[PDB]
Write a protein that binds this ligand. Structure first.
Ligand SMILES: CCCCCCCCCCCCCCCCCC(=O)OC[C@H](COP(=O)([O-])OCC(O)COP(=O)([O-])OC[C@@H](COC(=O)CCCCCCCCCCCCCCCCC)OC(=O)CCCCCCCCCCCCCCCCC)OC(=O)CCCCCCCCCCCCCCCCC
Ligand SMILES: CCCCCCCCCCCCCCCCCC(=O)OC[C@H](COP(=O)([O-])OCC[N+](C)(C)C)OC(=O)CCCCCCCCCCCCCCCCC
Ligand SMILES: CCCCCCCCCCCCCCCCCC(=O)OC[C@H](COP(=O)([O-])OCC[N+](C)(C)C)OC(=O)CCCCCCCCCCCCCCCCC
Ligand SMILES: CCCCCCCCCCCCCCCCCCCC(=O)O[C@H](COC(=O)CCCCCCCCCCCCCC)COP(=O)(O)OCCN
Ligand code: HEC
Ligand code: HEM
Ligand code: HEM
Ligand code: HEM
Ligand SMILES: CCCCCC[C@H]1C(=O)O[C@H](C)[C@H](NC(=O)c2cccc(NC=O)c2O)C(=O)O[C@@H](C)[C@@H]1OC(=O)CC(C)C
Ligand SMILES: CCCCCCCCCCCCO[C@@H]1O[C@H](CO)[C@@H](O[C@H]2O[C@H](CO)[C@@H](O)[C@H](O)[C@H]2O)[C@H](O)[C@H]1O
Ligand SMILES: CCCCCCCCCCCCO[C@@H]1O[C@H](CO)[C@@H](O[C@H]2O[C@H](CO)[C@@H](O)[C@H](O)[C@H]2O)[C@H](O)[C@H]1O
Ligand SMILES: O=C1C(O)=C([C@H]2CC[C@@H](c3ccc(Cl)cc3)CC2)C(=O)c2ccccc21
Ligand SMILES: O=C1C(O)=C([C@H]2CC[C@@H](c3ccc(Cl)cc3)CC2)C(=O)c2ccccc21
Ligand code: FES
Ligand code: FES
Lengths: 383, 54, 244, 71, 124, 85, 186, 111, 110
């Protein structure tokens, strides 16, 4: 028996990256999983490297980031790589969640990797945010204020929790140092959860774009998907290179190159491109608690897809009506993204509310209804 | 052509040695080639081009 | 918002550094330093730039040492522990006009002139915004604009009313290379210089990106050949079914 | 002398003539409105910022490339 | 959702003259656009099978039907990965799109739902 | 639900003969021109409406909203803006 | 359709010269090129990336430290910081110099005479970092009464030559010049 | 005019309100106010609006003179405060908090 | 032998972790400790001395060194927890030894 199978440690690696039996027909949207793995590796490498140069003290943090840009050899690269990969991480993770929603990867028997995934998505948001704050530019400080005040929504104890998370009466040095600690930590927690959702997936194996069983026709993970994943690694690095080397600040907010001034917040508050959809959700709802609940619920509601999709068929390849509904849902999520960065003015206030209702009605109304009707259309239509 | 396969490719030791020696040659020549190219497209712009005045 | 509240968006000027393979024009950088030194440094600091940063960009080692050596900086206390000054060295930072924010505001009718080391990255528009702003003071404010006291009308600045007056006028600087120092020329030079200040790695960055684009393109092409090659048994697989 | 002064004037009389007249008309109206008494105790005071921005935005589009070519 | 649910609801529709008159043409078009026949599938090949109930139904298939199902899935997987469609005899013609599995899953589920019901019976 | 090599959990297979050739024996880019043009056109055409319909609708919606917003903050849009607030 | 011995048509894909060495070699050229660019790329990535840990530009500031000598009495050692490393400056007495000139150079891990070390017998100038692992030896202590590194017990001489203990070399001498007879620069 | 005094890192808006500003504030029927308060309850001296200038929604500092009730507008989620610094539109639930402030002299206040 | 050998690496990582942690205080022993350990690479001939400088990020232990020890001291424990987990996974093939050194396959307890 082959060493790779005999030896307990190798056997675990083997089962994940070499002999792992995968469906033979996964398309390029199955490549985001490995890109997110690559982003996670880049982020750890550049992140730990920035941590060797960055100073968490509020009096020095912004300056240490300038020192990284200016004085550290290749510091510019490491910094921009870290910042840009955080954007690519979100492109890839929305792509990956997109793929999963379109192909019904959330349905049995994969509800567990899906649900662990939803937590990875929340942790990524908190990691990337905590990392945003470490620059301690204007947006950084204000972002900190808002995120740490989302717990004020929680009644009674809320206000005290806020002060406890700031370690002060305002965002200041204490907050910045604890964000550094946690921003360093959170990615390792995220890598644990990323691993766990794979372990949960390993019981069912990957879904495939047809949504049928692949038990009839499996391919070893290597060499087929190893070499397939290189294509996207290099395509990703091409896009990475164009941002990192040619336009490192395209995805950034100018205001973060202003040091944090707790006395003013910029007139143009617009968070990271990837938080924009939920930020528009938060703006839409005119209640404090309401706004917060809705924003969190916009992520947590993904947890109910396993229930509300009533289809007897896995995924959307074969469901014209569901594909159209999914197209409108995705475009609405992009519209929310767009509305996140306009000014809070007519007519976009009402529009943002309509998009927020449409976002939630996909999970609560439309998906359950459409999936029910298409079940019936398949049965009647094929008699 | 068989000969070339037999020498540089058949043994993996030899193939990897050839790839790393090629990477060495490529790395050194690519650096030099881009340096010259970069100086030609940004001619008269760079410090090396105005340095002579001082 | 109204156009006023946003500021007019600056024109996109064809800077030498725009373009994937284009460096800064270092001659322009040098001229722009001279504009910073002779106009802007009266009010604006450039705190993140050290003398050594000019070396081999705009100035030789010797010219920059000469600039540093003209100034006095805080030394370590002497042997009796009394404070001392020393002449500047290349590792010292270019010193600001003002000791603190309050002194800066006092000299500027309450307004604080920002540090310019990062201003090209800190404003939408970057170089174009700096050039548009410096050159964009109309002789007369558009009829109907009421400026707050000590504000000057400049459409590019959000709100329209900027605490910085027009400062570039034809021949406020005498360039050492004999270039005609027109308002536009000085604004272009100083805008370029400030953009370099904000992103000094720019030249290296774009060159390494060029090498990376080439290598990564080739690797992407080859990776696709290799993927297709390895997958061809699966793609080319054929089935014959004889129902049992 | 400043190359921008000539290019801006050329672009105003030429490709941005429509916007030049709009700004002109606007200023005429607003100045006349300011001249009239009890203007200070009016609700709405008209400005010409919009027209100015249309003009400047136009001039910039027709000038930017030309100006930087002569520097 | 259960196949039982889908089948009973479909039968309610096919009973009502009005309903069938408007729904049957919709469903036939839906199925044409669905395009599973263009990969040589029968409708029933697409039913989610990673369920206790469905695994049991699939074990109940006659060997013939079972072998043919495996073949259609293998063949469709191959079309999918090649990004080709079925041609000629591989395309499922409407007359070949038989509900080979529905009887088996309906029997499996009938028992499973009876079992749930009888687990909750109350002697009167 | 999925096993491993040898006991993958396929319903028993019989009667499928699978044939393939070596990667070295095949042209990996055979018929690439045909595929790149005709096959991609086929696949694009078949999916086009699923992208075009939502993109065109939400681009229309955005366009209308952005044009209204622009117009409300002009002089002409003073009155309609006053009503909106 | 039926016979399994009639292999399906593969002619659209089959290479005629599939069995030539030229044929394999071509695909290995592709794989090898990809390995070559990966290797060039990896080396470039690692080299550039790890260089961040090398001394940054701000650290790379050089010193040039000028020290007086009038202050320093006979039979004393000073410590001047220079590049964060300490510089031992000892104002050696006549009999100290004599003591140093005695040891046969033959029996010395690092064979050097005081003449090679100092450019002026009355000014022992050394980089006062122990050549073993890098502590700063405590002067006047030792067993050769010069300097003793307390970390692993290596003894330096009045020339600052290593006599006993793990240190392999004698205490390094910086580049120092007597600008005046009363001031040296380092 | 409105000043910003740092106090416990939080900004303090101090506005020197004109007569007609005070009038404007005293107008709104208290009934229709998320947080029903009159200016009299807020200020201890009508000419000195003193508030903790942190928006009661999530905690940005509203930009003064902007708004729609021409007082303060929080740019973060678009909540509008009044000339009393009462919330009128947007997600903020409470009116801008008033610190404990005393006029020691008529020309100086302590916070 | 495998859990043992992985264990030996955990032991080395613990030494490096706890050491890097010692340095973070930046008291007198901390700074000297840093000097000594980074100079153990000076033992390595030729390149050795350049490595020392590279590890310090300077010519001496200073700010650069302390910040990089902080980064690595935070990191090293998570690496060490991975290795601790791995040596258990390696042990899980044989199970724990016992004080008699005989097989326990005859008599196991949850
Ligand atoms: C970010 C980091 C960079 C890394 C790159 C990763 C992106 C790769 C990926 O997942 O998408 C490529 C992906 C190619 O993947 P594939 O494995 O050949 O087929 C995947 C589809 O399921 C196959 O879909 P299909 O066979 O139905 O083909 C559909 C596709 C045609 O697909 C093409 O290849 C073009 O055409 C369209 O849907 C375009 C809409 C019409 C526009 C007018 O492109 C798409 O098909 C994108 C369609 C999305 C809408
Ligand atoms: C933007 C609009 C999205 C519409 C997509 C509709 C399907 C389509 O045409 O796509 C092509 C293809 C169609 O592939 P398919 O597998 O359905 O069909 C292949 C061909 N047949 C049917 C013959 C087997 O769809 C995908 O590959 C969709 C992947 C979804 C990724 C979404 C990312 C958005 C991020 C938001 C996160 C929350
Ligand atoms: C990232 C590091 C890249 C290192 C490149 C060094 C050479 C290895 C390589 O490219 O693969 C060739 C070799 C083998 O490629 P191969 O497996 O196609 O070669 C075996 C067949 N012969 C020897 C007859 C050509 O790859 C490896 O040994 C694994 C290293 C991966 C890199
Ligand atoms: C960590 C972040 C990963 C992203 C990598 C992208 C480029 C980073 C390298 C810097 C760079 O621009 O390299 C150029 C060459 O491009 C290249 O050749 C590099 C592109 C290659 C990308 C993929 C190859 C390996 C990436 C990661 C593998 C990790 C293994 C070891 C680190 C410049 O060249 P130069 O002159 O700066 O080079 C020195 C020797 N001449
Ligand atoms: C004597 C005063 C003074 C001089 C001279 C001066 N500035 Fe300023 N500048 C200011 C003040 C004050 C502000 C702040 C204006 C405000 O925020 O209202 C300012 C603002 C700016 C801003 C940014 C405005 C913004 O977007 O916040 C830039 C860029 C700028 N100056 C660049 C320059 C350059 C370039 C020069 C000369 C080449 C220059 N300044 C000369 C006083 C000056
Ligand atoms: C750090 C972030 C993540 C990484 C590195 C990661 C990685 C992967 C990998 C490698 C796979 C298997 C290959 C693939 O299908 O692409 C996978 C599958 C999956 N991931 Fe993720 N993932 C991450 C985040 C998420 C999130 C946020 C979700 C869900 C919200 C998610 C849900 C899933 C599901 C459901 C599968 C099974 C999909 C299937 O193969 O049909 N993952 N992931
Ligand atoms: C998922 C993994 C990570 C994500 C998504 C992430 C995201 C980010 C983001 C968005 C920033 C703001 C960057 C900027 O605009 O400058 C940042 C900064 C930072 N991150 Fe991370 N990060 C990750 C992992 C790590 C890790 C593992 C470390 C290890 C310490 C780290 C260290 C830092 C440091 C020190 C900064 C501040 C310096 C800077 O802004 O560049 N990060 N991170
Ligand atoms: C972070 C440090 C470590 C942790 C948390 C850890 C934990 C454990 C645990 C829980 C076991 C099983 C129960 C037990 O026998 O006590 C174990 C067994 C073992 N550990 Fe460790 N260990 C660590 C370090 C080491 C080191 C440094 C070595 C070897 C140099 C080592 C070698 C072993 C071996 C050989 C066993 C199998 C012993 C047996 O049960 O007969 N471990 N360890
Ligand atoms: C070294 C052994 C340790 C085991 C974990 C390491 C990683 C691992 O298992 O890699 C695999 C290559 C995996 N891909 C797939 O499953 C995969 C499956 C099907 C199709 C494709 N692609 C399609 O075309 C795939 O790419 C992957 O990228 O998942 C990473 C996230 C894993 O990292 C972790 O969870 C740990 C941590 C670094 C996040
Ligand atoms: C950095 C983290 C350290 C550990 C991470 C390494 C990879 C993750 C392994 C944890 C999951 C192991 O959980 C279990 O491991 C065994 C051992 O291979 C694997 O077992 C799998 O392959 C083996 C043989 O290759 C089959 O007998 C088995 O049917 C199949 O399930 C599965 O993957 C999983 O059932
Ligand atoms: C996996 C680990 C294996 C151990 C490998 C150890 C590698 C660490 C050594 C760092 C080497 C850096 O050495 C230094 O590299 C930089 C680039 O980084 C080179 O720098 C050269 O190219 C860069 C761009 O790449 C230019 O900014 C620079 O002007 C030019 O001189 C130097 O000529 C070289 O002195
Ligand atoms: O007002 C906001 C704001 O609302 C967010 C938001 C958007 C995304 C939110 C979020 C989304 C999803 C989850 Cl699961 C949790 C938080 C977090 C807060 C920010 O990131 C921000 C940054 C800088 C200044 C202001 C702000
Ligand atoms: O002089 C030393 C010294 O020599 C060691 C150390 C060096 C390395 C340690 C060590 C490193 C690696 C291994 Cl595998 C085992 C021990 C053991 C003692 C120290 O830790 C030290 C700490 C504080 C001040 C001085 C010193
Ligand atoms: S440190 Fe000097 S004796 Fe070892
Ligand atoms: S932060 Fe003040 S409006 Fe939400």
């Amino acid at each position: 028996m082959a060493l790779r199978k005999k030896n307990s440690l190798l056997n675990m690696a083997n089962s994940y990256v070499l002999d792992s039996p995968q469906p033979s027909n996964l398309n390029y949207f199955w490549n985001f999983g490995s890109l997110l793995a690559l982003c996670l590796v880049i982020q750890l490498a550049t992140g730990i490297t920035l941590a060797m140069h960055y100073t968490s003290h509020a009096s020095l943090a912004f300056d240490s980031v300038e020192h990284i840009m200016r004085d550290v050899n290749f510091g510019w690269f490491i910094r921009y790589a870290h910042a840009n990969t955080a954007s690519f991480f979100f492109i890839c993770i929305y792509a990956h969640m997109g793929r999963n929603i379109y192909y019904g990867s959330y349905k049995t028997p994969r509800v567990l990797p899906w649900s662990i995934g939803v937590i990875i998505f929340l942790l990524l948001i908190i990691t990337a945010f905590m990392g945003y704050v470490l620059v301690f530019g204007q947006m950084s400080l204000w972002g900190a204020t808002v995120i740490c005040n989302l717990v004020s929504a929680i009644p009674w104890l809320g206000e005290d929790i806020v002060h406890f998370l700031w370690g002060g009466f305002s965002v200041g040095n204490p907050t910045l140092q604890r964000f550094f600690a946690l921003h360093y930590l959170m990615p390792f927690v995220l890598a644990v959860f990323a691993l766990l959702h794979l372990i949960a997936l390993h019981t069912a194996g990957s879904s495939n774009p047809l949504g049928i069983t692949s038990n009839v026709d499996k391919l070893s993970m290597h060499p087929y998907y190893s070499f397939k994943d290189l294509i996207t690694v290099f395509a990703f690095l091409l896009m990475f290179t164009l941002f990192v080397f040619f336009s490192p600040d395209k995805l950034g907010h100018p205001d973060n190159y202003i040091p944090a001034n707790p006395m003013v917040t910029p007139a143009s508050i617009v968070p990271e491109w990837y938080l924009l959809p939920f930020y528009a959700i938060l703006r839409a709802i005119p209640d404090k608690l309401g706004g917060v609940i809705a924003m969190v619920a916009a992520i947590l509601i993904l947890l109910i897809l396993p229930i509300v999709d009533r289809s007897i068929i896995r995924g959307n390849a074969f469901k014209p009506i569901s594909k159209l509904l999914f197209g409108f849902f995705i475009c609405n999520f992009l519209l929310l993204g767009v509305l996140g960065q306009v000014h809070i003015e007519p007519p976009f206030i009402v529009l943002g509310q309509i998009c927020t209702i449409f976002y939630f009605s996909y999970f609560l109304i439309l998906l359950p209804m459409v999936s029910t009707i298409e079940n019936i259309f398949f049965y009647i239509g094929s008699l | 052509a068989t000969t070339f396969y037999n020498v540089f490719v058949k043994r993996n030791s030899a193939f990897v040695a050839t790839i790393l020696a090629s990477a060495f040659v490529f790395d050194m020549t690519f650096e030099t080639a881009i340096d010259n190219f970069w100086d030609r497209i940004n001619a008269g712009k760079q410090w090396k081009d105005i340095r002579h005045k001082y | 918002m109204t156009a006023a509240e946003h500021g007019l968006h600056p024109a996109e000027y064809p800077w030498p550094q725009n373009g994937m393979l284009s460096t800064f024009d270092h001659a322009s950088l040098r001229r722009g330093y001279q504009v910073y030194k002779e106009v802007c440094a009266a009010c604006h600091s450039l705190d993140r730039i050290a003398w050594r940063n000019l070396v081999g960009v705009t100035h030789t080692t010797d010219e920059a040492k000469a600039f540093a050596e003209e100034l006095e900086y805080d030394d370590e206390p002497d042997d009796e522990g009394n404070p001392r000054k020393r002449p500047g060295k290349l590792a010292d930072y270019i010193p600001g006009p003002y000791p603190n924010e309050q002194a800066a505001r006092a000299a500027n009718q309450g307004a604080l002139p920002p540090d310019l080391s990062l201003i090209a990255k800190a404003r939408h528009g970057g170089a174009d915004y700096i050039f548009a702003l410096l050159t964009g003071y109309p002789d007369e404010p558009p009829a109907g604009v009421v400026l707050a006291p000590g504000m000057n009308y400049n459409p590019y600045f959000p709100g329209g009313g900027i605490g910085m007056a027009r400062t570039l006028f034809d021949g406020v600087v005498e360039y050492e290379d004999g270039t005609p120092a027109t308002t536009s020329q000085m604004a272009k030079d100083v805008a370029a210089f400030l953009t370099w200040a904000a992103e000094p790695e720019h030249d290296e960055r774009k060159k390494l990106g060029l090498k990376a684009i080439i290598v990564i393109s080739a690797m992407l092409g080859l990776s696709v050949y290799i993927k297709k090659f390895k997958w061809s048994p699966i793609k080319n697989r054929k089935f014959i079914y004889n129902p049992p | 002398p400043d190359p921008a002064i000539a290019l801006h004037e050329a672009a105003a009389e030429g490709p941005c003539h429509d916007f030049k007249h709009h700004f002109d008309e606007c200023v005429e109206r607003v100045t006349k409105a300011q001249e009239a008494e009890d203007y200070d105790h009016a609700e709405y005071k008209e400005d010409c910022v919009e027209e100015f921005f249309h003009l400047q935005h136009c001039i910039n589009d027709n000038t930017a490339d030309k100006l930087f070519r002569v520097l | 959702a259960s196949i039982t649910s889908v089948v009973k609801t479909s039968e309610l529709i096919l009973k009502s003259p009005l309903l069938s008159k408007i729904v049957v043409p919709l469903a036939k078009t839906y199925v044409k656009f669905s395009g599973y026949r263009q990969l040589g599938f029968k409708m029933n090949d697409l039913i989610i099978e990673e369920t206790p109930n469905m695994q049991l139904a699939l074990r109940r298939l006659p060997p013939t039907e079972s072998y043919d199902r495996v073949y259609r899935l293998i063949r469709a997987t191959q079309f999918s990965l090649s990004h080709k469609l079925a041609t000629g005899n591989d395309i499922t013609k409407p007359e070949e799109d038989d509900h080979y599995l529905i009887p088996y899953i309906l029997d499996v589920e009938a028992e499973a739902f009876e079992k749930d019901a009888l687990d909750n019976l109350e002697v009167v | 639900y999925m096993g491993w090599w040898g006991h993958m959990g396929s319903p028993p297979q019989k009667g499928i003969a699978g044939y393939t050739i070596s990667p070295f024996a095949a042209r990996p880019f055979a018929g690439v021109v045909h595929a790149a043009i005709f096959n991609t056109f086929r696949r694009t055409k078949n999916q086009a409406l699923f992208v075009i319909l939502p993109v065109s609708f939400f681009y229309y919606v955005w366009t209308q909203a952005s044009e209204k917003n622009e117009w409300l903050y002009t002089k002409a849009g003073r009155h309609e803006l006053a009503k909106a607030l | 359709g039926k016979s399994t011995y009639k292999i399906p048509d593969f002619t659209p894909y089959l290479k005629k010269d599939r069995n030539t060495d030229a044929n394999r070699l071509f695909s290995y050229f592709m794989i090898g090129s990809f390995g070559m660019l990966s290797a060039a790329g990896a080396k470039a990535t690692v080299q550039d990336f790890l260089s961040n840990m090398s001394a940054s530009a701000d650290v790379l500031a050089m010193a040039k430290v000028e020290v007086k000598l009038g202050a320093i009495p006979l039979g004393k050692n000073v410590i001047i910081k220079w590049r964060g490393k300490p510089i031992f400056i000892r104002h050696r007495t006549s009999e100290e110099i004599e003591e140093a000139n005695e040891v046969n150079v033959a029996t010395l891990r690092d064979p050097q005479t005081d003449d090679e070390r100092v450019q002026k017998p009355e000014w022992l100038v050394m980089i006062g970092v122990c050549t073993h692992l890098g502590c700063v030896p405590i002067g006047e202590a030792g067993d050769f009464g010069g300097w003793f590194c307390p970390c692993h017990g290596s003894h330096y001489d009045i020339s600052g030559r290593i006599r006993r203990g793990p240190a392999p070399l004698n205490l390094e001498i910086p580049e120092y010049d007597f600008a005046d007879a009363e001031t040296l620069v380092i």
